[PDB]
Design an enzyme around this catalytic site. Structure first.
Site, mmCIF file in Angstrom:
data_model
loop_
_atom_site.group_PDB
_atom_site.id
_atom_site.type_symbol
_atom_site.label_atom_id
_atom_site.label_comp_id
_atom_site.label_asym_id
_atom_site.label_seq_id
_atom_site.Cartn_x
_atom_site.Cartn_y
_atom_site.Cartn_z
ATOM 1 N N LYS A 1 33.251 43.706 51.786
ATOM 2 C CA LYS A 1 33.869 43.154 52.977
ATOM 3 C C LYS A 1 32.949 43.341 54.162
ATOM 4 O O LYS A 1 32.745 42.407 54.915
ATOM 5 C CB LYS A 1 35.315 43.682 53.192
ATOM 6 C CG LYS A 1 36.105 43.878 51.875
ATOM 7 C CD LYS A 1 37.355 43.017 51.587
ATOM 8 C CE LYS A 1 37.811 43.056 50.109
ATOM 9 N NZ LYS A 1 37.585 44.297 49.271
ATOM 10 N N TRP B 1 46.790 49.536 46.704
ATOM 11 C CA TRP B 1 46.069 48.436 46.070
ATOM 12 C C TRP B 1 46.445 48.450 44.575
ATOM 13 O O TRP B 1 46.203 49.442 43.891
ATOM 14 C CB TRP B 1 44.576 48.636 46.309
ATOM 15 C CG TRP B 1 43.666 47.596 45.783
ATOM 16 C CD1 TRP B 1 43.701 46.258 46.041
ATOM 17 C CD2 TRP B 1 42.531 47.815 44.942
ATOM 18 N NE1 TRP B 1 42.671 45.627 45.390
ATOM 19 C CE2 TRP B 1 41.933 46.558 44.711
ATOM 20 C CE3 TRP B 1 41.958 48.955 44.361
ATOM 21 C CZ2 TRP B 1 40.784 46.404 43.899
ATOM 22 C CZ3 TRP B 1 40.824 48.809 43.549
ATOM 23 C CH2 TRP B 1 40.254 47.541 43.329
ATOM 24 N N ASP C 1 38.797 56.124 48.503
ATOM 25 C CA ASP C 1 38.434 54.728 48.420
ATOM 26 C C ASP C 1 38.059 54.254 49.832
ATOM 27 O O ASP C 1 38.919 54.194 50.718
ATOM 28 C CB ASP C 1 39.632 53.958 47.901
ATOM 29 C CG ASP C 1 39.326 52.510 47.639
ATOM 30 O OD1 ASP C 1 38.301 52.007 48.123
ATOM 31 O OD2 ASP C 1 40.141 51.850 46.952
HETATM 32 C C1 LIG Z 1 41.310 49.556 49.088
HETATM 33 C C2 LIG Z 1 40.368 48.809 48.193
HETATM 34 N N1 LIG Z 1 39.525 49.442 47.346
HETATM 35 C C3 LIG Z 1 38.650 48.847 46.529
HETATM 36 C C4 LIG Z 1 38.514 47.454 46.485
HETATM 37 C C5 LIG Z 1 37.483 46.923 45.492
HETATM 38 O O1 LIG Z 1 36.769 45.716 45.831
HETATM 39 P P1 LIG Z 1 35.390 45.331 45.258
HETATM 40 O O2 LIG Z 1 35.370 45.822 43.827
HETATM 41 O O3 LIG Z 1 35.366 43.860 45.523
HETATM 42 O O4 LIG Z 1 34.397 46.100 46.067
HETATM 43 C C6 LIG Z 1 39.405 46.619 47.374
HETATM 44 C C7 LIG Z 1 39.385 45.131 47.387
HETATM 45 O O5 LIG Z 1 40.109 44.495 48.141
HETATM 46 C C8 LIG Z 1 40.352 47.345 48.272
HETATM 47 O O6 LIG Z 1 41.205 46.734 49.134
#
Ligand SMILES: Cc1ncc(COP(=O)(O)O)c(C=O)c1O
Length: 409
Positions: free
Chosen positions: A257, A139, A221
């Protein structure tokens, strides 16, 4: 005369952001956008989860709720329930009171706060030199966040084997064996973004072994628990294994999500430590970082998640909603693979179903992607990443055939 901002450079737009604009502009009727960053239904619409609508009604009609500052670390019930979700209700780390939870601004915020803490209190005092390992393709924002925290040595571990369209376990393990002791390793707990390939449980045992041997710090993560496979327990298997193998670690959790709550910015940094008293100290310093960032976190999203996870009927309804999402993704994978095979497309396509979660490295190369974008109006990144939920029963035939053309030509 000259403005104080006169020499400020216009920043480059984000690749995903440009891609989608180019799509909207585009007028050919067959166009498909497979680069959207969020779950979409078979009708190309966002999906508010029924349990969320239900819990929002209950919140709106609860006259006991005020708007007074939450604690710096966040809503207590959200933080406990969130960490419980990840670690499992009978986790020893919890029984032994050596788990901390910091409510954060999505997964991004949890990564940020965790990174800031490490650049200040881990592997010495203000040690910006500690190497930070991220997956080869990862990411985009993993690097940017750890750089923003001050880390100057950000490294890649091997992960995606383009040749074999799968996990380079030997590369990965090798790179881990060569890591300076105490290096930080950013791991995707499940539904690898952007590839979709996860290690199997047996490959995880091998990853952990090396990490244990070289005292590497896992920073998980976990952005897709439940959403990935439809199975909350299975999606957290690696995290719980590292617990059982005695690790200390951080785990940045997102509810964007799995609750569809993207714009309410609901995340949690789970901290697992060796001894309870030490965890209290860590949290005390997490507070200082939070204070100079956002002061304290927003309530609405965390309230929704807490209400849902603490009520067994809503919990059940939510797991149902999540399973709807994971079932659609599974199905579009299965169907894309079956069609590519029925058209006898060169190469193997089992990667499409071996992968888990909303994102798939299709295995196309950049020239092949250029064909899809430029010739067929099917929008995806040069890397060959697609959002599997952008596949619909309506556009599937056209996408499969376009991919067949691409690979063949
Ligand atoms: C692997 C991963 N980590 C963290 C995030 C962080 O998203 P958010 O800050 O919207 O929770 C994303 C968003 O797509 C992701 O794919």
């Amino acid at each position: 005369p000259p403005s104080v901002f006169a020499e400020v450079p216009q920043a480059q737009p984000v690749l995903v952001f440009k891609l989608t604009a180019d799509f909207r502009e585009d007028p050919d009727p067959r166009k498909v956008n497979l680069g959207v960053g969020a779950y979409r239904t078979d009708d190309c619409h966002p999906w508010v989860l029924p349990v969320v609508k239900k819990v929002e009604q209950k919140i709106a009609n609860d006259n006991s709720l005020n708007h007074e500052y939450l604690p710096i670390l966040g809503l207590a019930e959200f933080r406990s329930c969130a960490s419980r979700l990840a670690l499992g209700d009978d986790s020893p780390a919890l029984k032994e009171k050596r788990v901390g939870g910091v409510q954060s601004l999505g997964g991004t915020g949890a990564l940020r706060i965790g990174a800031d803490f490490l650049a200040r209190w881990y592997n010495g005092t203000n040690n910006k030199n500690t190497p930070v390992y991220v997956s080869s393709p990862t990411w985009e924002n993993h690097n940017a966040v750890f750089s923003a925290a001050g880390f100057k040595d950000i490294r890649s571990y091997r992960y995606w084997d383009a040749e074999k369209r799968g996990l380079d376990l030997q590369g990965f393990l090798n790179d881990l064996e060569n890591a300076p002791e105490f290096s930080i390793v950013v791991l995707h707990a499940c539904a690898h973004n952007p590839t979709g390939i996860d290690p199997t449980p047996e490959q995880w045992k091998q990853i952990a072994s090396v990490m244990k041997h070289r005292f590497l710090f896992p920073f998980f993560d976990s952005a897709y628990q439940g959403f990935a496979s439809g199975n909350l327990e299975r999606d957290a298997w690696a995290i719980r294994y590292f617990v059982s193998e005695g690790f200390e670690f951080f785990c940045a959790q997102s509810f964007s999500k799995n609750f569809g709550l993207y714009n309410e910015r609901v995340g949690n940094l789970t901290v697992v430590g060796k001894e309870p008293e030490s965890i209290l100290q860590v949290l005390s310093q997490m507070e200082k970082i939070v204070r100079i960032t956002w002061s304290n976190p927003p309530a609405q999203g965390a309230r929704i998640v807490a209400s849902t996870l603490s009520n067994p009927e809503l919990f059940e309804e939510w797991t149902g909603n999540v399973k709807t999402m994971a079932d659609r993704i599974l199905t579009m994978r299965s169907e894309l693979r079956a069609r590519l095979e029925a058209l006898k497309t060169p190469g193997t396509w089992n990667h499409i179903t071996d992968q888990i979660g909303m994102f798939s490295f299709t295995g196309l190369n950049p020239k092949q992607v250029e064909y899809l974008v430029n010739e067929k109006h099917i929008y995806l990144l040069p890397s060959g990443r697609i959002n599997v939920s952008g596949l619909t029963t309506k556009n599937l035939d056209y996408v499969a055939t376009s991919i067949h053309e691409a690979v063949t030509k």
